[PDB]
Short mmCIF file of all heavy atoms in Angstrom, two decimals:
data_model
loop_
_atom_site.label_atom_id
_atom_site.label_comp_id
_atom_site.label_asym_id
_atom_site.label_seq_id
_atom_site.Cartn_x
_atom_site.Cartn_y
_atom_site.Cartn_z
N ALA A 76 1.66 13.15 -8.03
CA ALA A 76 0.46 13.25 -8.84
C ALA A 76 -0.54 12.10 -8.62
O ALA A 76 -1.69 12.19 -9.03
CB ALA A 76 0.82 13.41 -10.32
N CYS A 77 -0.11 11.02 -7.98
CA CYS A 77 -1.03 9.92 -7.70
C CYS A 77 -1.57 10.02 -6.28
O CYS A 77 -2.45 9.24 -5.89
CB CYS A 77 -0.37 8.58 -7.89
SG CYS A 77 -0.24 7.99 -9.61
N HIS A 78 -1.01 10.96 -5.50
CA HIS A 78 -1.40 11.19 -4.11
C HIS A 78 -1.36 9.90 -3.34
O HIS A 78 -2.32 9.51 -2.67
CB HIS A 78 -2.80 11.81 -4.05
CG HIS A 78 -2.96 13.01 -4.93
ND1 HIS A 78 -2.59 14.27 -4.53
CD2 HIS A 78 -3.40 13.12 -6.20
CE1 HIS A 78 -2.80 15.12 -5.52
NE2 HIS A 78 -3.29 14.45 -6.54
N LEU A 79 -0.22 9.25 -3.41
CA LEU A 79 -0.02 7.99 -2.77
C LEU A 79 1.36 7.95 -2.19
O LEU A 79 2.26 8.64 -2.68
CB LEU A 79 -0.06 6.86 -3.80
CG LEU A 79 -1.21 5.91 -4.03
CD1 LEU A 79 -0.67 4.79 -4.92
CD2 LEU A 79 -1.74 5.36 -2.73
N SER A 80 1.52 7.11 -1.18
CA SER A 80 2.81 6.88 -0.57
C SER A 80 3.42 5.80 -1.46
O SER A 80 2.75 4.83 -1.85
CB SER A 80 2.64 6.37 0.86
OG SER A 80 3.88 5.88 1.37
N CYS A 81 4.69 5.98 -1.79
CA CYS A 81 5.37 5.01 -2.62
C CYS A 81 5.38 3.64 -1.95
O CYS A 81 5.59 2.61 -2.62
CB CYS A 81 6.80 5.47 -2.91
SG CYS A 81 6.95 7.00 -3.89
N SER A 82 5.14 3.60 -0.63
CA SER A 82 5.12 2.32 0.06
C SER A 82 3.90 1.53 -0.39
O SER A 82 3.95 0.30 -0.48
CB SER A 82 5.16 2.49 1.59
OG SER A 82 4.16 3.34 2.10
N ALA A 83 2.86 2.25 -0.79
CA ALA A 83 1.63 1.64 -1.28
C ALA A 83 1.88 0.84 -2.57
O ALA A 83 1.13 -0.08 -2.90
CB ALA A 83 0.56 2.73 -1.51
N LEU A 84 2.96 1.17 -3.26
CA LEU A 84 3.33 0.51 -4.50
C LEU A 84 4.24 -0.70 -4.23
O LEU A 84 4.72 -1.35 -5.17
CB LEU A 84 4.02 1.52 -5.46
CG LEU A 84 3.26 2.69 -6.13
CD1 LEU A 84 2.43 3.47 -5.13
CD2 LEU A 84 4.24 3.64 -6.79
N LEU A 85 4.47 -1.04 -2.96
CA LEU A 85 5.30 -2.20 -2.60
C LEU A 85 4.45 -3.26 -1.89
O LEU A 85 4.97 -4.21 -1.29
CB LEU A 85 6.46 -1.76 -1.68
CG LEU A 85 7.90 -1.61 -2.22
CD1 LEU A 85 7.93 -1.31 -3.70
CD2 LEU A 85 8.68 -0.56 -1.43
N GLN A 86 3.14 -3.07 -1.97
CA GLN A 86 2.19 -3.98 -1.35
C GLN A 86 1.80 -5.12 -2.27
O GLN A 86 1.91 -5.00 -3.48
CB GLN A 86 0.97 -3.19 -0.86
CG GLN A 86 1.36 -2.25 0.29
CD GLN A 86 0.25 -1.38 0.80
OE1 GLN A 86 0.49 -0.48 1.60
NE2 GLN A 86 -0.95 -1.63 0.35
N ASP A 87 1.42 -6.25 -1.69
CA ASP A 87 1.00 -7.42 -2.48
C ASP A 87 -0.30 -7.08 -3.21
O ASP A 87 -0.50 -7.47 -4.36
CB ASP A 87 0.78 -8.66 -1.60
CG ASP A 87 2.08 -9.40 -1.23
OD1 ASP A 87 3.19 -8.80 -1.19
OD2 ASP A 87 1.98 -10.62 -0.93
N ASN A 88 -1.19 -6.37 -2.55
CA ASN A 88 -2.43 -5.97 -3.21
C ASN A 88 -2.06 -4.84 -4.18
O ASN A 88 -1.64 -3.78 -3.75
CB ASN A 88 -3.46 -5.47 -2.18
CG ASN A 88 -4.77 -5.05 -2.82
OD1 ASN A 88 -4.93 -5.12 -4.04
ND2 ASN A 88 -5.72 -4.61 -2.01
N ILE A 89 -2.25 -5.07 -5.48
CA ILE A 89 -1.90 -4.08 -6.51
C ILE A 89 -2.97 -3.10 -6.96
O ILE A 89 -2.77 -2.35 -7.91
CB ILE A 89 -1.25 -4.77 -7.76
CG1 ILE A 89 -2.24 -5.71 -8.46
CG2 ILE A 89 -0.02 -5.58 -7.35
CD1 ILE A 89 -1.69 -6.22 -9.79
N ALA A 90 -4.10 -3.05 -6.27
CA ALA A 90 -5.16 -2.10 -6.63
C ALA A 90 -4.59 -0.66 -6.68
O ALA A 90 -4.90 0.15 -7.55
CB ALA A 90 -6.27 -2.18 -5.60
N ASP A 91 -3.80 -0.36 -5.68
CA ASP A 91 -3.11 0.91 -5.49
C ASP A 91 -2.22 1.22 -6.70
O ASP A 91 -2.38 2.25 -7.34
CB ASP A 91 -2.26 0.77 -4.21
CG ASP A 91 -2.00 -0.72 -3.84
OD1 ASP A 91 -2.87 -1.30 -3.11
OD2 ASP A 91 -0.97 -1.29 -4.35
N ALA A 92 -1.28 0.33 -6.97
CA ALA A 92 -0.35 0.46 -8.07
C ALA A 92 -1.13 0.61 -9.39
O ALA A 92 -0.77 1.41 -10.27
CB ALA A 92 0.60 -0.71 -8.10
N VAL A 93 -2.24 -0.11 -9.50
CA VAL A 93 -3.09 -0.02 -10.69
C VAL A 93 -3.78 1.35 -10.81
O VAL A 93 -3.79 1.92 -11.89
CB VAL A 93 -4.10 -1.19 -10.75
CG1 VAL A 93 -5.31 -0.83 -11.61
CG2 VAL A 93 -3.42 -2.45 -11.31
N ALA A 94 -4.31 1.90 -9.72
CA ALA A 94 -4.98 3.22 -9.80
C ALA A 94 -3.98 4.29 -10.25
O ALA A 94 -4.29 5.17 -11.07
CB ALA A 94 -5.57 3.61 -8.46
N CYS A 95 -2.75 4.17 -9.76
CA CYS A 95 -1.70 5.09 -10.12
C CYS A 95 -1.21 4.89 -11.58
O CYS A 95 -1.00 5.87 -12.29
CB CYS A 95 -0.54 5.00 -9.12
SG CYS A 95 0.76 6.26 -9.35
N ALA A 96 -1.03 3.64 -12.02
CA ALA A 96 -0.60 3.40 -13.42
C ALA A 96 -1.63 3.97 -14.39
O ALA A 96 -1.30 4.40 -15.50
CB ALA A 96 -0.34 1.89 -13.68
N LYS A 97 -2.89 3.97 -13.96
CA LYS A 97 -4.01 4.51 -14.74
C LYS A 97 -3.90 6.05 -14.81
O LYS A 97 -4.14 6.67 -15.87
CB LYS A 97 -5.35 4.07 -14.14
CG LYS A 97 -5.77 2.67 -14.58
CD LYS A 97 -7.02 2.27 -13.82
CE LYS A 97 -7.46 0.87 -14.19
NZ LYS A 97 -8.65 0.59 -13.37
N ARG A 98 -3.46 6.65 -13.71
CA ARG A 98 -3.24 8.09 -13.64
C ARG A 98 -2.12 8.45 -14.62
O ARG A 98 -2.23 9.37 -15.40
CB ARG A 98 -2.82 8.48 -12.23
CG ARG A 98 -2.32 9.90 -12.12
CD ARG A 98 -3.34 10.89 -12.67
NE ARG A 98 -2.86 12.27 -12.66
CZ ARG A 98 -2.15 12.83 -13.63
NH1 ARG A 98 -1.80 12.13 -14.72
NH2 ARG A 98 -1.77 14.10 -13.51
N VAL A 99 -1.02 7.71 -14.49
CA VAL A 99 0.17 7.85 -15.32
C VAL A 99 -0.19 7.84 -16.82
O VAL A 99 0.28 8.68 -17.57
CB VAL A 99 1.19 6.69 -15.03
CG1 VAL A 99 2.39 6.75 -16.00
CG2 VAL A 99 1.66 6.73 -13.58
N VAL A 100 -1.03 6.89 -17.24
CA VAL A 100 -1.39 6.82 -18.65
C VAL A 100 -2.33 7.89 -19.20
O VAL A 100 -2.61 7.89 -20.39
CB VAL A 100 -1.90 5.41 -19.06
CG1 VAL A 100 -0.78 4.43 -18.98
CG2 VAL A 100 -3.09 5.00 -18.23
N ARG A 101 -2.80 8.80 -18.34
CA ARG A 101 -3.68 9.91 -18.75
C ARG A 101 -2.84 11.14 -19.12
O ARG A 101 -3.36 12.23 -19.33
CB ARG A 101 -4.71 10.24 -17.66
CG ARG A 101 -5.55 9.02 -17.27
CD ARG A 101 -6.87 9.40 -16.62
NE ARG A 101 -6.69 9.92 -15.27
CZ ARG A 101 -6.76 9.17 -14.17
NH1 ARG A 101 -7.01 7.86 -14.26
NH2 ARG A 101 -6.62 9.75 -12.98
N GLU A 102 -1.53 10.94 -19.25
CA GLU A 102 -0.61 11.99 -19.63
C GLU A 102 -0.50 11.97 -21.17
O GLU A 102 -0.85 10.97 -21.80
CB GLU A 102 0.77 11.71 -19.01
CG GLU A 102 0.86 11.96 -17.53
CD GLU A 102 0.76 13.44 -17.17
OE1 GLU A 102 1.63 14.22 -17.62
OE2 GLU A 102 -0.18 13.83 -16.45
N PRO A 103 -0.01 13.05 -21.79
CA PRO A 103 0.13 13.10 -23.25
C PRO A 103 0.73 11.84 -23.90
O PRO A 103 0.21 11.32 -24.87
CB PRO A 103 1.06 14.30 -23.45
CG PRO A 103 0.64 15.24 -22.34
CD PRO A 103 0.51 14.29 -21.15
N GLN A 104 1.81 11.33 -23.32
CA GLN A 104 2.49 10.16 -23.87
C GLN A 104 1.93 8.78 -23.55
O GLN A 104 2.38 7.77 -24.11
CB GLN A 104 3.98 10.21 -23.52
CG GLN A 104 4.32 10.00 -22.05
CD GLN A 104 5.81 10.00 -21.80
OE1 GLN A 104 6.62 9.97 -22.73
NE2 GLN A 104 6.19 10.02 -20.54
N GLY A 105 0.96 8.72 -22.65
CA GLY A 105 0.37 7.45 -22.28
C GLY A 105 1.36 6.42 -21.78
O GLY A 105 2.22 6.71 -20.95
N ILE A 106 1.26 5.22 -22.33
CA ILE A 106 2.08 4.08 -21.95
C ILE A 106 3.56 4.24 -22.30
O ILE A 106 4.39 3.48 -21.82
CB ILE A 106 1.51 2.76 -22.56
CG1 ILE A 106 2.13 1.53 -21.86
CG2 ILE A 106 1.71 2.73 -24.07
CD1 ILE A 106 1.30 0.25 -21.98
N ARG A 107 3.89 5.28 -23.09
CA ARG A 107 5.28 5.57 -23.49
C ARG A 107 6.06 6.11 -22.28
O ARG A 107 7.25 6.35 -22.37
CB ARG A 107 5.31 6.61 -24.64
CG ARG A 107 4.89 6.06 -26.02
CD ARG A 107 4.71 7.15 -27.10
NE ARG A 107 5.80 8.12 -27.16
CZ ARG A 107 6.94 7.94 -27.85
NH1 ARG A 107 7.14 6.83 -28.56
NH2 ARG A 107 7.90 8.87 -27.78
N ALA A 108 5.34 6.31 -21.17
CA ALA A 108 5.88 6.76 -19.90
C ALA A 108 6.84 5.70 -19.34
O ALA A 108 7.65 5.98 -18.45
CB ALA A 108 4.76 6.96 -18.92
N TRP A 109 6.73 4.48 -19.86
CA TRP A 109 7.57 3.38 -19.45
C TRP A 109 8.47 3.00 -20.64
O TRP A 109 8.01 2.34 -21.57
CB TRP A 109 6.70 2.17 -19.11
CG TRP A 109 5.90 2.25 -17.82
CD1 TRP A 109 6.33 1.90 -16.57
CD2 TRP A 109 4.53 2.67 -17.66
NE1 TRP A 109 5.32 2.09 -15.64
CE2 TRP A 109 4.21 2.56 -16.29
CE3 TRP A 109 3.56 3.14 -18.56
CZ2 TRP A 109 2.95 2.90 -15.78
CZ3 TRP A 109 2.29 3.48 -18.04
CH2 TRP A 109 2.01 3.36 -16.66
N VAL A 110 9.75 3.38 -20.66
CA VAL A 110 10.50 2.97 -21.83
C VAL A 110 10.80 1.50 -21.96
O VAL A 110 11.18 1.05 -23.03
CB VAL A 110 11.73 3.83 -22.25
CG1 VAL A 110 11.41 5.29 -22.15
CG2 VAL A 110 13.01 3.42 -21.53
N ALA A 111 10.59 0.70 -20.91
CA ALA A 111 10.82 -0.73 -21.12
C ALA A 111 9.69 -1.25 -22.02
O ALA A 111 9.85 -2.24 -22.71
CB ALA A 111 10.88 -1.51 -19.81
N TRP A 112 8.54 -0.57 -22.02
CA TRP A 112 7.42 -0.96 -22.90
C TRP A 112 7.85 -0.57 -24.32
O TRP A 112 7.70 -1.34 -25.27
CB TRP A 112 6.11 -0.23 -22.54
CG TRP A 112 5.03 -0.51 -23.52
CD1 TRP A 112 4.21 -1.61 -23.56
CD2 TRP A 112 4.70 0.28 -24.67
NE1 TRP A 112 3.42 -1.57 -24.70
CE2 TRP A 112 3.69 -0.42 -25.39
CE3 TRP A 112 5.15 1.51 -25.17
CZ2 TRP A 112 3.14 0.07 -26.59
CZ3 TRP A 112 4.60 2.01 -26.37
CH2 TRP A 112 3.61 1.29 -27.06
N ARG A 113 8.39 0.63 -24.44
CA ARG A 113 8.87 1.12 -25.71
C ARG A 113 9.91 0.13 -26.25
O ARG A 113 9.76 -0.35 -27.36
CB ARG A 113 9.54 2.47 -25.57
CG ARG A 113 8.68 3.68 -25.23
CD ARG A 113 9.56 4.91 -25.45
NE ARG A 113 9.05 6.16 -24.88
CZ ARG A 113 9.68 7.33 -24.97
NH1 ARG A 113 10.84 7.42 -25.61
NH2 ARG A 113 9.15 8.42 -24.43
N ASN A 114 10.92 -0.20 -25.45
CA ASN A 114 11.99 -1.12 -25.86
C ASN A 114 11.62 -2.57 -26.12
O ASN A 114 12.08 -3.16 -27.08
CB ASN A 114 13.10 -1.18 -24.80
CG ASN A 114 13.70 0.16 -24.49
OD1 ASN A 114 13.33 1.17 -25.07
ND2 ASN A 114 14.62 0.17 -23.55
N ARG A 115 10.80 -3.13 -25.25
CA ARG A 115 10.45 -4.55 -25.32
C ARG A 115 9.03 -4.92 -25.70
O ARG A 115 8.72 -6.11 -25.81
CB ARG A 115 10.68 -5.15 -23.95
CG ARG A 115 12.04 -4.89 -23.34
CD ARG A 115 13.03 -5.92 -23.83
NE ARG A 115 14.35 -5.67 -23.28
CZ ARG A 115 15.35 -6.54 -23.32
NH1 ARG A 115 15.19 -7.73 -23.86
NH2 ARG A 115 16.51 -6.19 -22.80
N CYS A 116 8.17 -3.94 -25.90
CA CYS A 116 6.78 -4.25 -26.18
C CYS A 116 6.20 -3.63 -27.42
O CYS A 116 5.42 -4.27 -28.14
CB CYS A 116 5.92 -3.84 -24.99
SG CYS A 116 6.49 -4.61 -23.43
N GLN A 117 6.52 -2.36 -27.61
CA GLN A 117 6.05 -1.57 -28.74
C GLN A 117 6.48 -2.14 -30.09
O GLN A 117 7.64 -2.50 -30.31
CB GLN A 117 6.53 -0.12 -28.55
CG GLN A 117 6.14 0.87 -29.65
CD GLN A 117 6.57 2.31 -29.33
OE1 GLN A 117 5.74 3.23 -29.38
NE2 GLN A 117 7.84 2.51 -29.01
N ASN A 118 5.52 -2.19 -31.01
CA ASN A 118 5.76 -2.70 -32.35
C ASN A 118 6.22 -4.15 -32.38
O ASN A 118 7.05 -4.55 -33.19
CB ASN A 118 6.74 -1.78 -33.08
CG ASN A 118 6.28 -0.35 -33.08
OD1 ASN A 118 5.08 -0.07 -33.21
ND2 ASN A 118 7.22 0.58 -32.87
N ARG A 119 5.66 -4.94 -31.47
CA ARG A 119 5.95 -6.36 -31.39
C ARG A 119 4.64 -7.00 -30.96
O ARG A 119 3.78 -6.33 -30.40
CB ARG A 119 7.08 -6.62 -30.38
CG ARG A 119 8.49 -6.34 -30.93
CD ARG A 119 9.28 -5.32 -30.11
NE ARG A 119 10.19 -5.92 -29.13
CZ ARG A 119 11.52 -5.87 -29.19
NH1 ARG A 119 12.14 -5.25 -30.20
NH2 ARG A 119 12.26 -6.37 -28.19
N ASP A 120 4.41 -8.25 -31.31
CA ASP A 120 3.16 -8.90 -30.91
C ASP A 120 3.33 -9.29 -29.45
O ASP A 120 4.26 -10.01 -29.11
CB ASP A 120 2.90 -10.14 -31.77
CG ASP A 120 1.58 -10.82 -31.42
OD1 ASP A 120 0.76 -10.24 -30.68
OD2 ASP A 120 1.36 -11.95 -31.91
N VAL A 121 2.47 -8.76 -28.59
CA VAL A 121 2.54 -9.07 -27.16
C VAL A 121 1.38 -9.93 -26.66
O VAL A 121 1.25 -10.14 -25.46
CB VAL A 121 2.64 -7.77 -26.27
CG1 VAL A 121 3.88 -6.99 -26.62
CG2 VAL A 121 1.39 -6.91 -26.43
#
């Protein structure tokens, strides 16, 4: 869905990874797509 090679997400330049994370967050659940955020970030002062 990001139309990217996963290798693009292993690059030092993160523009790629950022465009895709932005795509990811346009889904119904948004940032909840990452449960480590749910576990370690949600409902806590970050």
Side-chain angles (χ1 to χ4, degrees):
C77 280
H78 309 275
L79 256 193
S80 168
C81 296
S82 54
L84 291 48
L85 256 26
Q86 293 177 189
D87 279 26
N88 180 0
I89 64 172
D91 20 272
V93 157
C95 187
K97 278 174 182 178
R98 169 54 184 87
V99 175
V100 293
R101 304 201 288 266
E102 286 291 299
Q104 69 178 349
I106 196 158
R107 286 171 47 85
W109 288 274
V110 317
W112 174 81
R113 291 192 195 180
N114 303 359
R115 309 275 179 167
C116 304
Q117 180 175 233
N118 306 322
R119 280 123 96 112
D120 182 11
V121 299

